[PDB]
Each structure stands twice: as structure tokens, then as C-alpha cells.
Design a protein around this ligand. Structure first.
Ligand SMILES: Cn1c(CCC(=O)O)nc2ccccc2c1=O
Ligand SMILES: [Zn+2]
Ligand SMILES: [Zn+2]
Ligand SMILES: [Zn+2]
Length: 99
């Protein structure tokens, strides 16, 4: 992945409620291929399901999303995966919840 991107500034603090990696898509309710938005922590499905996270990006402009499949972070603007220390806390919380 990229070691940095200009949208890391939009990554917001993790809710003290934590993350639920089994949370369904906020629109369609699918349990498959969900992502969590690292700005507002809404959960929506991936491109290969119903594309609700891509829709959320288009309607919010929020840049960076974390996969509940493999804990990768995608930036929609840079069209790349990104990893940086600003993402370690959220990845690690997600990992602890998942495994
Ligand atoms: C990994 N990835 C993703 C991940 C997030 C998603 O599934 O909503 N979204 C894309 C959207 C348009 C074009 C490409 C991608 C892409 O390669
Ligand atoms: Zn959906
Ligand atoms: Zn968002
Ligand atoms: Zn970016």
C-alpha cells in the first residue's frame, strides 16, 4: 500500500463504543464485504455487493474506508490502499474485535 496519503487528515477518532466487524451494511443489511468509514464510522458494503460504501463516498466526500474482511484501508480519491501509523489504532481495534 501507499505509506501516506493527503486524506489521512480526515481519519477521525475511534468511537469509544469500538468497532463491530460483523455490523451489516447500513443501507441494504448485507453481512458481506462491509467496510467502515474512517471519518464517520458508518458501515456500508463493498463494490462487489451493492456498492453502498462507494455511494457513501460520493455523497459525503469521505476518503478512507477500512475493510472488515482483511483490515485494509482504501482511499477512494487516491484509488489506492494506504497504511500509516494514523491507521494502526483503528486496525488493531478491528483486529481485536474480529479475531
Ligand atoms: C479496492 N477498491 C475499492 C474498495 C472499497 C469498495 O469496495 O467500495 N473500491 C473501489 C471503487 C472503485 C474502483 C476501484 C475500487 C477498488 O479497487
Ligand atoms: Zn449495501
Ligand atoms: Zn463517512
Ligand atoms: Zn488519499
Amino acid at each position: 500500500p501507499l505509506p501516506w496519503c493527503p486524506h489521512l487528515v480526515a481519519v477521525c477518532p475511534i468511537p469509544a463504543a469500538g468497532l463491530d466487524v460483523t455490523q451489516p451494511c447500513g443501507d441494504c443489511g448485507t453481512i458481506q464485504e462491509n467496510w467502515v468509514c474512517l471519518s464517520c464510522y458508518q458501515v456500508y458494503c463493498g463494490r462487489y455487493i451493492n456498492g453502498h460504501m462507494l455511494q457513501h463516498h460520493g455523497n459525503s466526500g469521505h476518503p478512507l474506508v477500512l475493510s472488515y474482511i482483511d483490515l485494509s484501508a482504501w482511499c477512494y480519491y487516491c484509488q489506492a490502499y494506504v497504511h500509516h501509523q494514523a491507521l494502526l489504532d483503528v486496525k488493531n481495534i478491528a483486529h481485536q474485535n474480529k479475531f
